[PDB]
Protein backbone atom coordinates (compact mmCIF):
# COMPACT_ATOMS: atom_id res chain seq x y z
CA UNK A 1 0.00 0.00 0.00
CA UNK A 2 2.24 2.80 -1.26
CA UNK A 3 -0.49 5.48 -1.21
CA UNK A 4 -1.58 6.84 2.16
CA UNK A 5 -5.03 8.05 1.04
CA UNK A 6 -7.76 6.82 -1.28
CA UNK A 7 -7.97 8.85 -4.48
CA UNK A 8 -11.41 9.55 -5.96
CA UNK A 9 -11.61 9.92 -9.74
CA UNK A 10 -13.25 13.02 -11.16
CA UNK A 11 -15.58 12.99 -14.19
CA UNK A 12 -13.98 14.32 -17.36
CA UNK A 13 -17.33 14.13 -19.17
CA UNK A 14 -18.60 17.08 -17.12
CA UNK A 15 -15.06 18.21 -16.30
CA UNK A 16 -14.19 20.43 -13.36
CA UNK A 17 -11.69 23.17 -14.15
CA UNK A 18 -8.89 24.64 -12.03
CA UNK A 19 -6.64 27.62 -12.65
CA UNK A 20 -3.68 29.47 -11.16
CA UNK A 21 -1.27 32.23 -12.14
CA UNK A 22 2.34 31.72 -13.19
CA UNK A 23 5.41 33.84 -12.49
CA UNK A 24 5.01 35.43 -15.94
CA UNK A 25 1.47 36.50 -14.84
CA UNK A 26 -0.24 34.20 -17.35
CA UNK A 27 -3.10 31.94 -16.30
CA UNK A 28 -2.71 28.15 -16.30
CA UNK A 29 -5.90 26.11 -16.68
CA UNK A 30 -6.32 22.37 -16.19
CA UNK A 31 -9.08 19.82 -15.67
CA UNK A 32 -9.40 18.05 -12.33
CA UNK A 33 -8.50 14.38 -12.75
CA UNK A 34 -8.62 12.84 -9.26
CA UNK A 35 -8.60 14.10 -5.70
CA UNK A 36 -7.56 12.98 -2.24
CA UNK A 37 -6.75 14.44 1.17
CA UNK A 38 -3.06 14.53 0.18
CA UNK A 39 -3.22 16.12 -3.25
CA UNK A 40 -4.81 16.10 -6.68
CA UNK A 41 -4.15 15.15 -10.29
CA UNK A 42 -5.04 17.30 -13.28
CA UNK A 43 -4.84 17.45 -17.07
CA UNK A 44 -3.47 20.34 -19.11
CA UNK A 45 -5.24 21.80 -22.13
CA UNK A 46 -2.23 22.71 -24.29
CA UNK A 47 1.24 21.26 -24.28
CA UNK A 48 3.02 22.22 -21.08
CA UNK A 49 4.38 25.78 -21.12
CA UNK A 50 8.14 25.97 -20.68
CA UNK A 51 7.63 27.75 -17.35
CA UNK A 52 5.71 24.79 -15.91
CA UNK A 53 7.94 22.14 -14.33
CA UNK A 54 8.19 19.98 -11.23
CA UNK A 55 9.05 21.64 -7.93
CA UNK A 56 6.90 24.72 -8.49
CA UNK A 57 4.76 25.79 -5.53
CA UNK A 58 1.34 27.37 -6.02
CA UNK A 59 -0.70 29.57 -3.68
CA UNK A 60 -4.48 29.11 -3.59
CA UNK A 61 -5.17 27.17 -6.76
CA UNK A 62 -8.78 27.88 -7.68
CA UNK A 63 -10.66 24.58 -7.92
CA UNK A 64 -14.14 25.30 -9.31
CA UNK A 65 -16.35 22.38 -8.27
CA UNK A 66 -19.50 23.75 -9.90
CA UNK A 67 -22.58 23.56 -7.69
CA UNK A 68 -20.44 22.17 -4.86
CA UNK A 69 -18.56 25.48 -4.61
CA UNK A 70 -15.22 27.06 -5.45
CA UNK A 71 -12.13 26.31 -3.37
CA UNK A 72 -8.53 27.53 -3.20
CA UNK A 73 -5.65 25.29 -2.14
CA UNK A 74 -1.90 25.62 -1.86
CA UNK A 75 -0.05 22.83 -3.62
CA UNK A 76 3.35 21.76 -4.93
CA UNK A 77 3.67 20.38 -8.45
CA UNK A 78 5.32 17.02 -7.82
CA UNK A 79 5.38 15.41 -11.27
CA UNK A 80 4.51 16.05 -14.92
CA UNK A 81 3.65 12.84 -16.75
CA UNK A 82 1.93 11.75 -19.98
CA UNK A 83 -1.69 10.65 -20.30
CA UNK A 84 -2.48 8.78 -23.50
CA UNK A 85 -5.88 8.00 -25.04
CA UNK A 86 -6.81 6.48 -28.39
CA UNK A 87 -8.26 9.03 -30.83
CA UNK A 88 -11.58 8.69 -32.58
CA UNK A 89 -9.27 8.66 -35.60
CA UNK A 90 -7.53 5.66 -33.96
CA UNK A 91 -4.58 7.91 -33.08
CA UNK A 92 -2.72 8.13 -29.78
CA UNK A 93 -3.06 11.59 -28.22
CA UNK A 94 -0.58 12.61 -25.51
CA UNK A 95 -1.36 15.40 -23.05
CA UNK A 96 0.40 16.49 -19.84
CA UNK A 97 -0.71 14.99 -16.53
CA UNK A 98 -0.05 17.00 -13.37
CA UNK A 99 0.46 15.52 -9.91
CA UNK A 100 0.08 17.93 -6.99
CA UNK A 101 0.70 17.64 -3.27
CA UNK A 102 -1.42 19.92 -1.11
CA UNK A 103 0.48 22.34 1.14
CA UNK A 104 -0.51 24.01 4.42
CA UNK A 105 -3.38 21.57 4.97
CA UNK A 106 -4.94 23.02 8.11
CA UNK A 107 -7.75 21.12 9.85
CA UNK A 108 -10.32 23.26 8.02
CA UNK A 109 -8.68 22.68 4.62
CA UNK A 110 -9.05 18.91 5.00
CA UNK A 111 -12.62 19.65 6.10
CA UNK A 112 -13.18 21.10 2.62
CA UNK A 113 -11.34 18.23 0.91
CA UNK A 114 -13.57 15.63 2.58
CA UNK A 115 -16.62 17.67 1.57
CA UNK A 116 -15.51 17.56 -2.08
CA UNK A 117 -14.54 13.87 -1.93
CA UNK A 118 -17.93 12.67 -0.67
CA UNK A 119 -19.67 14.83 -3.27
CA UNK A 120 -17.55 13.13 -5.93
CA UNK A 121 -18.33 9.64 -4.60
CA UNK A 122 -22.05 10.42 -4.51
CA UNK A 123 -21.81 11.85 -8.03
CA UNK A 124 -19.84 8.96 -9.53
CA UNK A 125 -22.34 6.63 -7.85
CA UNK A 126 -24.94 8.47 -9.94
CA UNK A 127 -22.77 8.05 -13.04
CA UNK A 128 -22.97 4.30 -12.47
CA UNK A 129 -26.50 4.67 -11.07
CA UNK A 130 -27.50 4.87 -14.77
CA UNK A 131 -26.91 1.59 -16.65
N1 LIG B 1 5.62 11.49 -8.24
C2 LIG B 1 4.31 11.07 -8.24
N3 LIG B 1 3.72 10.84 -9.39
C4 LIG B 1 2.44 10.43 -9.44
C5 LIG B 1 1.73 10.25 -8.25
N6 LIG B 1 0.48 9.84 -8.59
C7 LIG B 1 0.39 9.76 -9.89
N8 LIG B 1 1.58 10.12 -10.45
C9 LIG B 1 1.88 10.17 -11.88
O10 LIG B 1 0.68 10.11 -12.66
C11 LIG B 1 0.72 8.94 -13.49
C12 LIG B 1 -0.68 8.35 -13.67
O13 LIG B 1 -1.28 8.06 -12.42
P14 LIG B 1 -2.62 7.18 -12.29
O15 LIG B 1 -3.69 7.75 -13.14
O16 LIG B 1 -3.10 7.11 -10.76
O17 LIG B 1 -2.28 5.69 -12.81
C18 LIG B 1 -1.42 4.83 -12.07
C19 LIG B 1 -2.25 3.98 -11.09
O20 LIG B 1 -3.50 3.61 -11.68
C21 LIG B 1 -1.34 2.76 -10.91
N22 LIG B 1 -0.51 2.95 -9.72
C23 LIG B 1 0.81 3.30 -9.72
N24 LIG B 1 1.23 3.39 -8.49
C25 LIG B 1 0.21 3.12 -7.64
C26 LIG B 1 0.10 3.07 -6.23
O27 LIG B 1 1.06 3.30 -5.51
N28 LIG B 1 -1.10 2.75 -5.70
C29 LIG B 1 -2.17 2.49 -6.51
N30 LIG B 1 -3.37 2.18 -5.93
N31 LIG B 1 -2.08 2.53 -7.82
C32 LIG B 1 -0.92 2.84 -8.42
O33 LIG B 1 -0.51 2.66 -12.07
C34 LIG B 1 -0.80 3.75 -12.96
C35 LIG B 1 0.48 4.24 -13.64
O36 LIG B 1 1.44 4.65 -12.67
P37 LIG B 1 2.71 5.55 -13.08
O38 LIG B 1 3.48 4.88 -14.15
O39 LIG B 1 3.64 5.77 -11.79
O40 LIG B 1 2.21 6.98 -13.62
C41 LIG B 1 1.65 7.96 -12.75
C42 LIG B 1 2.72 8.93 -12.23
O43 LIG B 1 3.68 9.25 -13.24
C44 LIG B 1 2.38 10.50 -7.02
O45 LIG B 1 1.79 10.36 -5.96
N46 LIG B 1 3.66 10.91 -7.05
N1 LIG C 1 -4.75 12.73 -5.84
C2 LIG C 1 -3.44 12.88 -6.20
N3 LIG C 1 -2.54 13.09 -5.27
C4 LIG C 1 -1.25 13.24 -5.58
C5 LIG C 1 -0.84 13.18 -6.92
N6 LIG C 1 0.50 13.36 -6.93
C7 LIG C 1 0.93 13.54 -5.72
N8 LIG C 1 -0.12 13.48 -4.85
C9 LIG C 1 -0.07 13.62 -3.39
O10 LIG C 1 1.26 13.97 -2.96
C11 LIG C 1 1.68 13.05 -1.96
C12 LIG C 1 3.20 12.87 -1.99
O13 LIG C 1 3.65 12.53 -3.31
P14 LIG C 1 5.12 11.95 -3.59
O15 LIG C 1 6.13 12.82 -2.94
O16 LIG C 1 5.40 11.90 -5.17
O17 LIG C 1 5.21 10.46 -2.99
C18 LIG C 1 4.34 9.40 -3.42
C19 LIG C 1 4.98 8.64 -4.59
O20 LIG C 1 6.40 8.63 -4.45
C21 LIG C 1 4.40 7.22 -4.44
N22 LIG C 1 3.28 7.05 -5.38
C23 LIG C 1 1.96 6.94 -5.06
N24 LIG C 1 1.25 6.80 -6.14
C25 LIG C 1 2.07 6.81 -7.22
C26 LIG C 1 1.87 6.70 -8.62
O27 LIG C 1 0.75 6.55 -9.08
N28 LIG C 1 2.95 6.75 -9.43
C29 LIG C 1 4.19 6.91 -8.90
N30 LIG C 1 5.27 6.96 -9.75
N31 LIG C 1 4.40 7.02 -7.61
C32 LIG C 1 3.38 6.97 -6.74
O33 LIG C 1 3.93 7.10 -3.09
C34 LIG C 1 4.20 8.30 -2.37
C35 LIG C 1 3.08 8.61 -1.38
O36 LIG C 1 1.80 8.60 -2.01
P37 LIG C 1 0.52 9.30 -1.32
O38 LIG C 1 0.28 8.70 0.01
O39 LIG C 1 -0.79 9.09 -2.24
O40 LIG C 1 0.81 10.88 -1.16
C41 LIG C 1 0.95 11.74 -2.29
C42 LIG C 1 -0.41 12.26 -2.75
O43 LIG C 1 -1.28 12.44 -1.63
C44 LIG C 1 -1.82 12.95 -7.91
O45 LIG C 1 -1.52 12.88 -9.09
N46 LIG C 1 -3.11 12.80 -7.52
| CA-36 nearest atom, ligand 2 | 1
Q: ∠ CA 104-106-109 to the nearest 5 degrees?
A: 100
Which of 10, 33, 41, 98 best tests ligand 1's pocket when mutated (most atoms within 8 Å of CB)? 41
Query: Which resolution, in Å, applies to this structure?
Result: 2.3
Tell me if 27 sits within 8 A of 20, measured CB to CB: yes
64: left (phi over 0), alpha (psi -120 to 50) or beta: beta
- Ligand 1 centroid from CA 25, angstroms: 30
67 DSSP 8-state letter: G
Cβ of 96 below 6 Å from ligand 2: no
Total domains present in the chain? 1
Name the structure determination technique.
Answer: X-ray
| CA-33 nearest atom, ligand 2 | 46
Range of the domain at 125: 1-131
In this structure, the strands spanning 57-64 and 70-86 are antiparallel
DSSP-based three-state secondary structure for 29? strand
DSSP alpha helices (H): ranges in the chain? 107-128
Closest ligand, as measured to the CA of 75: 2
121 DSSP 8-state letter: H
CA atoms within 13 A on the CB side of 23: 7
Amino acid sequence: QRRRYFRISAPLHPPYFCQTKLADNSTLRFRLYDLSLGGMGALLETAKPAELQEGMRFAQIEVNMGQWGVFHFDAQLISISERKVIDGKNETITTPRLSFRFLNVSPTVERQLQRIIFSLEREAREKADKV
